[PDB]
Every structure is written in structure tokens, then in C-alpha cells.
Amino acid sequence: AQRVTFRRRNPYNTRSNKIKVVKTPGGILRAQHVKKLATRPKCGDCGSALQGISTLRPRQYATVSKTHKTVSRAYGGSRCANCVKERIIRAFLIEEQKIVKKVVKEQTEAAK
Amino acid sequence: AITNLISKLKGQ
Amino acid sequence: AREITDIKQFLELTRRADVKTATVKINKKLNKAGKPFRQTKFKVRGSSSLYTLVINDAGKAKKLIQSLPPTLKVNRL
Amino acid sequence: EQERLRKIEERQKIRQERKEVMEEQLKTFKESLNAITEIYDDSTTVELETLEPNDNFEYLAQLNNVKL
Amino acid sequence: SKGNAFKHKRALVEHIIQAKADAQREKALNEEAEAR
Amino acid sequence: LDFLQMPAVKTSACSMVVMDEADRLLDMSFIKDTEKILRLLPKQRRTGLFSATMRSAGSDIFKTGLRNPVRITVNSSSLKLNYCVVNPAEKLQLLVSILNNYKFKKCIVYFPTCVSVSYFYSFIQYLGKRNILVNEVEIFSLHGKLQTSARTKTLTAFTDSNSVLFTTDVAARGIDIPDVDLVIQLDPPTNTDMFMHRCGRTGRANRVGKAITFLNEGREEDFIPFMQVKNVELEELDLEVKGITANFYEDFRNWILEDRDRFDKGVKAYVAFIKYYSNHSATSIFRLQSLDYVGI
Amino acid sequence: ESLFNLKTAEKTGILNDLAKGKKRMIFT
Amino acid sequence: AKFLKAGKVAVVVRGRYAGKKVVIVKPHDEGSKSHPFGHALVAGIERYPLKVTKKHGAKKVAKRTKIKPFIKVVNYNHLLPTRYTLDVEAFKSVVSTETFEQPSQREEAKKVVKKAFEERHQAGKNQWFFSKLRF
Amino acid sequence: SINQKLALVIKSGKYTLGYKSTVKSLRQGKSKLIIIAANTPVLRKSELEYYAMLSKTKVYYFQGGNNELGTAVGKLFRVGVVSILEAGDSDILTTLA
RNA sequence: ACCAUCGAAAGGGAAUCCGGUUAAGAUUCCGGAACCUGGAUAUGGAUUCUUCACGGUAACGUAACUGAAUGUGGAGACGUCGGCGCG
Ligand SMILES: [Zn+2]
């Protein structure tokens, strides 16, 4: 039944400043400003949240190790597993089709 | 020994 | 603040060149069996943190107290 | 009574619109696509009839027939 | 039950047991009526 | 089912499933187990359902998973079908009056429950101790709750000289004991479809065999027309109740008073029969209200 | 940039050779 | 016909070695107790040799030609088989089912595969196998 | 027709519906013919084509989408590719279709 | 290859809390406790024959585990409403 308000300069209900109410060890209710939550990194091909990569603020990534923001597979930390598998399969099939086209062309101008 | 893999009807 | 479960780590903390004081705090508290007992907290602050060792055994606390350096200041409670 | 009527003809208009858009969607996707009885020597007869466990064949055949 | 057929647990249990009895009985129902 | 559920057994190479007495295996009781058994096995296979009453399991055959099926019906007085309408309290006595008077090599007497099989087997053995019935008859009991080895030994002893068998519906279907002359159904079965099986153990190659059934005098007017609609004619047979001038129920009662185990077995069998009668198809024909509780 | 096509694999008239892996090429 | 046989060159599509080229040594079409699926023992390239230009010094040429191998048990669903083939005669006796249960045998098998691959690359054979796949 | 032969194979022969089952049968070499709908994605279709070229398995291109092929099989769910392990009582393999 | 700069104390943004204290000062002072950014450096450990590490079929895991030009991806970064679940 004790009423609390903002503790900073901004007096408006903006997304920047948001308030939680906590009971301090002094026995009173007090306001506390909450920071914006972090966002999971997303795959660069399909846009789904990357698996096994920590969710932090943009500047909090510079203070953790590489194993907390990467995956041991190729493109790990940038693309998910299915996208990488699709990339591998597509690249191999494209190269095989290029070989087949080159052989067919070598045959078709071999006539003259 | 294979010379063609794509199949088709015969009687048409 | 940090908690440590290692007695020798606490002793190593108290043996460094830049050590000021160690605090010994006593708490009379009951366990799950309902019988009350004496719990001792040994607190020393390192470079940037305060390390606390919690011991629920009286004999171990006495042995650790006897094993503290004689040139180390100890705050009782 | 008049309100219930105008409501049911509104339902008719809505159902016809939905059916028409569904048929148009199918049409435009199509382009993008491209008892025997046998007697033995003992005067005993055996009756043999084929059975259809998958009734879906008949249902699809009848739908195609009514569409035709 | 998604269609408001049963109003509480007792109704569901009674429907289950009545369905079991009717499943037991329909097979002889036909000859039972033909005989009479 | 237990065998296939073990992880050491792989079912992937199976290509042939056969169900004998497929109308019984698709019954309401067996459908739970057979559904799982077929669930484990691959769907692309060849199925053979074989049953002497395959028409009764009408639409439940497709539960087995037939792919390319062809139904087959084969059709041809081999044996006699009789019935007796008597008071229930005399029924066992009538059984005795058949065993020591009729002419047979093998008689199969059917009982509703297993506890009834054991109880009446013991009492008839006690009667034969007192020489109530005097004949070269050897009496066996075989119900389906026994250990498998005991069942096999009893069946092979009966199959191997004039013998009477007190058996439940385990022996009714499928198994063929040669030289069986008489079949008695002390009560009509819980389901009528099995009736044709219970009296079907005889009549092989048009052999002279007789089937007898017993009725409770109350709603006996409904069982005969019910079988008639199902194209079964039961010619009424009149049998005199011989030897019951005095003390049959008194003899039973004073034999029960010797051991309290006999009392327990008798009461348990009676209650089991009441429950068995509760689970009866053709409810109009077999009524609990019209049941002669005191007679039974 | 098109994926593998069996019609083009048959237009060359050599499918046994391709299945054996005869014409091996490295580009770029 | 069956094409997942010994000597078949495949591309790994799943796992840490995704996109790397391997050769099948022993295919197991029924699977083992530890790998209850259709799998294959493969030996592949983890670190491809680098291209050598005439500017490169003798000491450098040695460094760029080095090959790092790996040996793996790979599910068939995680392989993309090609139409090419490569001889597995030099190292077919070291990559078996027990090799992946014994780390010392795994180390010895990796050593043998490394020696064989380096010899084959220095000989000038199978230039497609020792070429990186661009994806 | 061609749908009659497929239905006969479904009723009497041996078959696998779906991409994973077809690929598994091709890997085992247990396939005699693969029917591919026109609705299948280009990457999966190309992979199936390459697999059939590797395993020397005949390829037939169904004239319809996955749901037409499913109805021809007799199923009420879409199927994109079918593999014929054994013709059985049908004759789809003999007629080159 | 491509244009300065200005423009928001309600937009984006690296990090501090409790208790106490004055006549009038507090997330600023006092006591305790803690984070952020930048910098120079030292020690331990790893970099396993001498030269940039491994495991799992896989999703992925790790105390580490070099990476120029060049080309990309994510967070920052984004309409409104309704019921349901949780703190
Ligand atoms: Zn992705």
C-alpha cells in the first residue's frame, strides 16, 4: 500500500524506463529500473534463433569467450544446421550439373 | 549396363 | 561476494601479502533434524571480492581457528 | 422473418465467393504444376468374392464421376 | 466432449459404460428381434 | 505379444500372418491384444484368416489389415441336436442319469466356469466312490486356469477306456479328439456363436454323435426359436430323472458339511455362475429376474 | 546455376561413365 | 545396385566435419550394438593442403602440403555420396569397429591415414579429393 | 491407365511412400522404379535424380502433383515420391512405366 | 569509392545497490558490498614430438584452442488487438 515512482529524470511511460517494485532489507517497497531484455541471435538464411549461442546485449558479447557465441560446425554462429546442409548439397549438385553441361557441350561441338 | 534411366509408357 | 568450500583456499587467501583482517562470525541455527547447532563463517576479502567459508562442524572450525596465522587480525563477530 | 431471410442470402453470397476463389486458386495452381461360384466333383460349390478394404478408391471415383 | 455432449465426469463415465453394454449387445439384437 | 515386445526380436522381415479361428481372435476380448500384435508387425504382408464362423466377424476383418483379399465360403443329418427342459436343482442328477445309461466311447460335459468344473468333478468322484454310478467310466477335468503341463497331460490322457471330460470353453473350439460320441452342454453358452462349436466336436464324417442341452424351464421358450432363426433345429428330448427318489440334495449337503473347503468351493462356484449369467448376450432370452436363484 | 538434371545426364549418352566417375573436373 | 561401398567418396553434411570430403572404408548396412543404424566408417580430410606457387620456398612448400586427417563413424543420412572413388587399400586394416573403442588405435589409424593421404597428394593423384568444396 | 498399375502395386506388391523411405531403399538397392511427382522441390528432386543415377534405378515422372499421386496410390494424404520394391501382381515394371 | 555540419534531458545508449546520516544534501555524502570501459604488463594453463586442441550418428558440448585484404550475417531494429499459461 506504499506508492513508488521513477528514480530517474524521465517521468514518462516510455519503453526506455520501466519499473519493478521490490522490498528492500529496510522493510519498504522501492522502485527499480529494469533494462531491456536481450534477443537471441538469428540465422542469416531462415531467421530462426540460433541454437547453443548465448543471448546477451550487443556489448556483452565482447566479454565472453568464443565457445559461448559459436558452434563448432562450419558457419557456426552464423547459420543453423539445416541451412548449412542445404548449402552443401546445393553446391555439390550445382558443380555436378556444371560438369554434365560441359561434357554435353564438348560432345555437341565435337561434331564439327 | 545402363543407357537410359527415365521411364515412359510403351503402347502410346 | 563469493563463497568458497575449500579450507586450504581460505588459508591461502589469508596468507597473501595484501591481507587486512579476517572476520569470524557465529550463528546459532537449527538444522533439518531440529537440533540447534553452531555455524561459523570465516570471511576474508581478496583483491576485489569477499570470500566466505561456512562450516557447520564445531571441531573443524576450532581446528581452522587454531590454524590461522598468528600475525593475522581476527574479528570475533 | 425478413431479417433471417436477408441473413441467409448473405450466407449464400459469402459461400459463393469462397467457392469461386477456391476454384480459381486450384485452376491457377494447375498451370504452375506443368461373386464367382465354382463347382467341384463332390457337388460342393465355393463362392469367391473380392473385397475392397480401401473405400477411398470408390469415393474418389464417384467424385470424379459426378464432376464429369 | 469438445461439443458439450457431457456436462460432468459422471456423465462421461455413464456414457462409457452404456456404450460398452450396447456394443456387447447389438450383435445379438438382430436375431433377438427376428425370433420374436 | 510378450515375445514380440522384447527388444531382442526384430519383426521387419515378416511377410505372412495367419489367424486361425479369426472370428474368436477379433472378438471384443481378444481385439486388444491382436491390435497390438498386428501393430508391431509390418503392414505390407499377406494375411490369412480362417474360421468356421467367419461370417459373424463381419466388418471386423478389415481391422486385421487386409490388402488384396478374397472371401471364401465353403458349404456342404450327421449328428443329433437335442435339449431337455428340467428344473435346475435336478440338472446334475440328470447328467448322472445320462452317464450311466447312454452308449458312448467319449462324453464331453461342458461347464460354465472353472471353479464349477473342479467342484462338480470332486463331487462326482465322491459319488463314484459310493458306487452311485456303476460303469467303466474314467472322469477327467480340464479347465483353462491350470498350469500348461497339467493341461497337456490331462488332454493327452483323455485322448488316449470310456472317458468323461468336464471342461470349460477351452476345448470347445478347434481341437479334435477322435472317437467322441456324446456332447453335453450343462448350460447354453454365454454367446450363441460358440454353441455350434461346442456341439461341433462330433459328426466328423457323418458319425453317429449326439449333442444335449439343458434349459431352466422359465424362459426356455425363447432359446429354441432363436436357434431356429439361425438355421439350427433342436429336437426336444424327454429324459426321465432316474434315481432321485430320495436324498440327492441331502447327500450333497451332508457331503458339504464334512469340509469347509467344500462349502467355500460350492458358494464360490454359485456366485461365479451368477456373474457369468450376468454377462449374457440375448438379454431377453436369459433374464436375471426370471432366473431360478433357489433352484440353482 | 542449375542443380543436377537426369535429362542432361542422359543427353550426353554416357551414363555408365558418369556413374563410374570418369570425367573429373575442377573449376575456378 | 548398392553404391555405399568401400572406396566411395562422400561429403559430410552434418556434424563438425560438415562439408568435408571423406572416403568410406567399411560400410555397415545393419548397424552395430553401439550404432543401431546404417552407418559407415570413413576417413576424411579435416584440413586441406594449401595451393603451392613457384614463389614458395622449399621450407614453405613442405608446410603448405601438410594434410590433417580424421576418422569418423557417420550415419548414412548424414552423408552425400558422390560418383567418384578412391583406393582405400593403404589403410583398410586400421579403421575397424574396435578402432573407435580404443583411443590408441584411433591415434594410430589417424597417423596411417595421414601418411597415406600425404603420399597420395604429393604423388599428384586424386586432385578433386584434396580440393576444398566451396559452399 | 497408369493409375491402375500403381493401385495394383499398392494392393499386391511392395512399395515405400515418401522421400526418406525412397532414399533408404535406394541406398539398400531394394528399389526397382521411383515415381516422382511434379510438385516435389527442386533440391530434393535433383538429389533423388542423382541417387537414381548412382544406383541405376529407373525414374518415372508422374504427371501430377503430390496429392494426385497420393490419390492414385489410394491415400488421402499427399505423397511426393514412391519407390516400387516389388511389382507383385501388377505389370508396371514390364511396361517400362 | 563519396561527401561537411546541425537537429531528441520522452527515440537508440557500457556500468551501483542496501543501510545510515543534515536545520536544510543523496542511486552524488559516510559504511559495507559490486559492476563498466580503456591501458601497460606479469604468472599459471593450454597450444601433446617438437609447430594453430578435442568429443558426440546428430542437434551440439569445451577452461583455452592464430587468422590480412576482401565479401556477408546477427543484435541495435520497430503496427495493433484478443484469450490462455507462468513469475
Ligand atoms: Zn537457418
Side-chain angles (χ1 to χ4, degrees):
Chain A
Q2 189 213 312
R3 296 167 269 186
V4 308
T5 189
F6 305 120
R7 286 168 77 177
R8 292 170 188 187
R9 197 199 183 79
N10 197 11
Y12 307 105
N13 203 285
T14 304
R15 177 193 35 168
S16 199
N17 66 334
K18 287 283 166 191
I19 298 299
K20 193 167 41 78
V21 178
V22 297
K23 210 191 291 191
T24 79
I28 66 185
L29 292 163
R30 192 172 285 171
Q32 272 184 349
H33 295 253
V34 306
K35 310 193 203 56
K36 308 209 205 185
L37 286 181
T39 310
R40 302 193 49 169
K42 306 295 195 300
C43 172
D45 278 338
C46 62
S48 55
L50 290 175
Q51 176 164 359
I53 286 146
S54 54
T55 300
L56 308 153
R57 291 305 274 162
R59 211 178 253 281
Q60 302 179 8
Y61 286 113
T63 56
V64 295
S65 44
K66 220 196 206 181
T67 77
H68 283 161
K69 65 179 72 66
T70 47
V71 171
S72 283
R73 186 189 46 256
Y75 288 87
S78 195
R79 266 71 168 195
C80 62
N82 302 340
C83 288
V84 168
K85 171 182 156 194
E86 271 188 275
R87 283 164 161 281
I88 298 155
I89 295 181
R90 173 164 266 119
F92 174 75
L93 289 172
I94 284 187
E95 183 178 1
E96 282 320 297
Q97 174 72 16
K98 282 188 53 171
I99 277 175
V100 173
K101 297 296 289 183
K102 190 70 181 83
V103 176
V104 170
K105 185 177 180 180
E106 283 180 352
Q107 285 194 359
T108 187
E109 292 83 4
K112 298 183 180 184
Chain B
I2 49 160
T3 61
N4 76 287
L5 277 296
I6 305 190
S7 295
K8 192 68 72 70
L9 277 296
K10 296 187 101 66
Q12 314 280 350
Chain C
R2 299 291 179 90
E3 200 203 330
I4 51 177
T5 61
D6 292 331
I7 297 169
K8 309 203 179 197
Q9 184 178 2
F10 182 77
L11 290 180
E12 174 151 48
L13 280 161
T14 68
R15 270 196 287 100
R16 311 186 326 191
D18 179 32
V19 58
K20 298 293 183 182
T21 311
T23 293
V24 175
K25 169 88 178 82
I26 315 299
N27 304 308
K28 298 293 183 182
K29 53 180 50 172
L30 61 83
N31 51 32
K32 298 189 178 177
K35 35 181 174 183
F37 72 99
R38 183 178 181 270
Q39 167 203 73
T40 303
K41 299 209 186 178
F42 300 86
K43 317 190 198 200
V44 65
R45 79 164 303 103
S47 171
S48 52
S49 192
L50 177 71
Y51 307 91
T52 290
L53 177 62
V54 188
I55 297 169
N56 306 272
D57 199 3
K60 191 142 46 192
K62 298 293 183 182
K63 283 206 304 167
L64 188 153
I65 281 171
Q66 293 299 90
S67 179
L68 284 164
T71 68
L72 176 80
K73 315 306 189 53
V74 173
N75 293 125
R76 295 316 200 120
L77 277 296
Chain D
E1 197 67 29
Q2 183 66 41
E3 172 73 26
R4 183 180 63 83
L5 263 69
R6 68 180 65 252
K7 172 250 291 184
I8 62 170
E9 285 85 5
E10 192 67 37
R11 286 179 187 170
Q12 281 195 34
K13 205 165 305 304
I14 301 299
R15 66 182 181 179
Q16 181 186 54
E17 285 179 358
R18 185 178 296 113
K19 290 286 295 163
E20 182 65 26
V21 302
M22 188 180 87
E23 305 301 281
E24 199 266 359
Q25 183 62 255
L26 269 51
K27 184 196 173 205
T28 187
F29 160 63
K30 174 65 172 179
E31 320 174 13
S32 160
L33 194 61
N34 267 272
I36 294 93
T37 177
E38 294 181 357
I39 297 89
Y40 290 122
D41 49 4
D42 292 331
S43 79
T44 46
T45 177
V46 285
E47 311 189 14
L48 299 103
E49 65 183 1
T50 178
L51 295 157
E52 187 50 60
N54 205 357
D55 59 301
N56 302 141
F57 277 109
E58 282 91 49
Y59 189 106
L60 277 296
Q62 291 199 355
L63 288 190
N64 204 279
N65 290 349
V66 299
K67 277 179 281 212
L68 282 184
Chain E
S1 71
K2 187 214 200 310
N4 195 40
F6 322 124
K7 278 74 176 176
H8 51 87
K9 160 180 178 186
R10 290 198 322 107
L12 181 52
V13 170
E14 288 165 2
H15 183 278
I16 284 173
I17 62 170
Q18 190 62 23
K20 159 174 196 169
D22 293 5
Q24 186 195 327
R25 184 176 179 179
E26 71 276 16
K27 50 189 296 294
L29 172 68
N30 305 311
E31 297 89 20
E32 183 178 1
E34 292 293 329
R36 275 189 172 268
Chain F
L1 181 61
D2 201 358
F3 181 88
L4 295 182
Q5 281 176 358
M6 307 285 286
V9 175
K10 304 303 186 308
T11 75
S12 184
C14 177
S15 179
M16 184 77 188
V17 183
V18 172
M19 289 168 53
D20 201 334
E21 314 298 332
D23 75 297
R24 176 56 165 164
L25 291 169
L26 300 172
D27 189 83
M28 193 174 304
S29 62
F30 272 109
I31 193 59
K32 186 188 195 296
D33 284 328
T34 66
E35 185 178 6
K36 307 173 176 187
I37 296 173
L38 300 156
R39 189 100 207 278
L40 301 181
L41 305 170
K43 287 211 167 177
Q44 299 179 31
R45 63 183 184 253
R46 301 262 73 92
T47 312
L49 315 186
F50 293 80
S51 181
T53 51
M54 199 65 259
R55 294 293 309 179
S56 45
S59 51
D60 297 6
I61 54 166
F62 307 102
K63 290 176 170 187
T64 317
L66 307 172
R67 296 205 296 156
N68 191 15
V70 175
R71 195 195 301 262
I72 297 165
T73 62
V74 174
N75 43 359
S76 296
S77 177
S78 58
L79 81 167
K80 291 82 186 183
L81 282 71
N82 295 256
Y83 70 90
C84 296
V85 188
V86 285
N87 180 70
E90 293 177 350
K91 203 173 304 302
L92 178 57
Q93 168 75 72
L94 212 166
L95 175 66
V96 190
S97 62
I98 303 185
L99 294 179
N100 51 20
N101 293 328
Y102 259 79
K103 190 71 65 178
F104 53 75
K105 298 180 59 175
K106 300 295 178 61
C107 174
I108 292 189
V109 186
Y110 291 94
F111 291 76
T113 71
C114 306
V115 53
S116 299
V117 166
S118 295
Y119 177 66
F120 289 139
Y121 176 83
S122 61
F123 182 73
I124 296 298
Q125 278 280 337
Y126 168 78
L127 293 189
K129 185 63 62 178
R130 304 176 49 84
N131 297 29
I132 281 305
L133 65 162
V134 44
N135 258 134
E136 188 66 20
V137 289
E138 186 64 45
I139 295 197
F140 295 153
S141 80
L142 170 63
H143 55 91
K145 283 194 182 175
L146 302 170
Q147 316 298 331
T148 309
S149 69
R151 288 167 42 164
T152 300
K153 186 166 55 180
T154 300
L155 186 67
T156 200
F158 176 81
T159 309
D160 296 333
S161 289
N162 297 349
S163 309
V164 189
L165 185 64
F166 290 12
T167 169
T168 54
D169 310 332
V170 53
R173 183 187 297 244
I175 70 165
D176 41 4
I177 317 104
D179 302 340
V180 168
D181 300 338
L182 185 64
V183 169
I184 290 176
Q185 308 188 39
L186 197 62
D187 292 318
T190 189
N191 72 317
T192 71
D193 190 299
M194 210 188 197
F195 174 88
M196 289 299 304
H197 289 278
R198 283 167 65 153
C199 57
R201 300 305 97 208
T202 57
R204 304 290 184 277
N206 297 263
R207 273 177 171 179
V208 180
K210 178 183 279 194
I212 307 179
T213 321
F214 288 67
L215 301 178
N216 295 252
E217 288 263 32
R219 295 273 190 267
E220 57 103 356
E221 298 296 335
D222 286 311
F223 186 63
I224 313 300
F226 191 73
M227 303 307 305
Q228 178 53 51
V229 172
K230 301 187 174 184
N231 301 337
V232 180
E233 170 74 14
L234 310 176
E235 50 172 4
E236 189 181 12
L237 169 58
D238 290 330
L239 299 180
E240 310 179 353
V241 208
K242 292 183 165 185
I244 194 169
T245 63
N247 319 137
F248 193 83
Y249 174 74
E250 173 75 39
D251 203 328
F252 208 168
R253 190 173 58 186
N254 63 51
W255 177 81
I256 291 301
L257 301 177
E258 297 185 15
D259 194 324
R260 199 185 181 111
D261 277 324
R262 317 188 190 282
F263 164 81
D264 295 343
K265 294 165 60 177
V267 63
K268 192 164 308 169
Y270 172 52
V271 180
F273 173 89
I274 287 308
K275 175 164 183 56
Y276 145 97
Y277 209 94
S278 174
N279 280 327
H280 221 309
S281 59
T283 301
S284 66
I285 304 184
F286 300 96
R287 299 286 294 183
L288 272 176
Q289 323 87 20
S290 300
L291 198 59
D292 188 1
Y293 293 107
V294 183
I296 301 289
Chain G
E1 271 193 344
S2 287
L3 303 155
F4 177 82
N5 207 3
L6 199 58
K7 289 173 274 169
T8 317
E10 301 201 336
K11 205 169 307 300
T12 187
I14 62 170
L15 272 157
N16 302 274
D17 287 29
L18 290 189
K20 288 181 190 78
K22 292 297 181 185
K23 325 264 187 199
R24 297 201 286 278
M25 288 159 202
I26 304 97
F27 307 99
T28 317
Chain H
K2 277 150 86 81
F3 50 95
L4 295 150
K5 64 180 73 174
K8 174 61 77 71
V9 166
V11 183
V12 190
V13 302
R14 281 206 184 279
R16 165 152 66 90
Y17 303 121
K20 297 296 193 317
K21 286 165 193 175
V22 307
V23 67
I24 302 188
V25 192
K26 292 182 181 180
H28 292 69
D29 305 306
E30 293 83 3
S32 76
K33 178 166 281 322
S34 48
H35 298 90
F37 41 83
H39 67 260
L41 320 179
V42 308
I45 317 183
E46 181 179 341
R47 184 177 293 170
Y48 294 89
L50 297 158
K51 280 141 172 44
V52 163
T53 304
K54 67 182 290 294
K55 186 181 283 187
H56 291 105
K59 180 157 293 186
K60 190 69 70 66
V61 171
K63 167 189 269 181
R64 308 257 281 174
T65 308
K66 282 167 50 168
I67 296 182
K68 198 179 184 191
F70 69 90
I71 52 166
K72 203 64 201 303
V73 182
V74 185
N75 191 350
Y76 283 161
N77 302 325
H78 308 159
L79 287 154
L80 179 73
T82 79
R83 77 210 175 83
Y84 316 99
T85 187
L86 186 136
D87 291 331
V88 297
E89 294 294 328
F91 46 84
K92 185 176 180 180
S93 59
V94 288
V95 187
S96 47
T97 310
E98 194 192 6
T99 286
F100 303 99
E101 317 175 12
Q102 310 282 340
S104 299
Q105 301 190 192
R106 188 181 296 188
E107 190 189 27
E108 183 64 55
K110 273 193 288 193
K111 203 181 170 182
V112 172
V113 171
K114 188 200 197 77
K115 188 187 155 201
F117 277 171
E118 269 159 47
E119 291 178 338
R120 199 175 297 259
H121 181 236
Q122 274 153 30
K125 310 157 168 290
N126 278 113
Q127 65 183 357
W128 184 89
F129 191 73
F130 304 112
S131 184
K132 186 185 289 183
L133 180 71
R134 298 297 299 271
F135 68 97
Chain I
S1 192
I2 188 64
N3 307 325
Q4 325 191 21
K5 314 176 177 184
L6 287 175
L8 207 43
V9 169
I10 295 307
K11 286 197 172 78
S12 69
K14 294 208 173 308
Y15 68 84
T16 47
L17 316 167
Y19 180 85
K20 286 171 75 186
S21 286
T22 299
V23 167
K24 190 169 172 214
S25 88
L26 258 57
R27 293 200 301 250
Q28 292 162 4
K30 279 169 52 74
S31 196
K32 306 282 196 298
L33 174 79
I34 49 166
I35 297 92
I36 305 168
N39 205 287
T40 180
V42 298
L43 194 66
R44 273 173 37 183
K45 178 167 155 282
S46 179
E47 184 159 17
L48 266 163
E49 293 196 77
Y50 196 82
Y51 276 177
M53 183 278 288
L54 290 186
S55 85
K56 292 175 263 287
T57 302
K58 282 302 191 99
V59 177
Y60 172 59
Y61 288 136
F62 192 81
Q63 289 300 325
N66 63 7
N67 44 56
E68 293 83 3
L69 179 53
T71 48
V73 175
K75 305 296 162 64
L76 269 177
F77 46 81
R78 313 167 264 123
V79 310
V81 60
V82 184
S83 187
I84 309 286
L85 318 176
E86 293 179 353
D89 186 74
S90 172
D91 71 291
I92 181 153
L93 306 185
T94 307
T95 187
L96 193 68

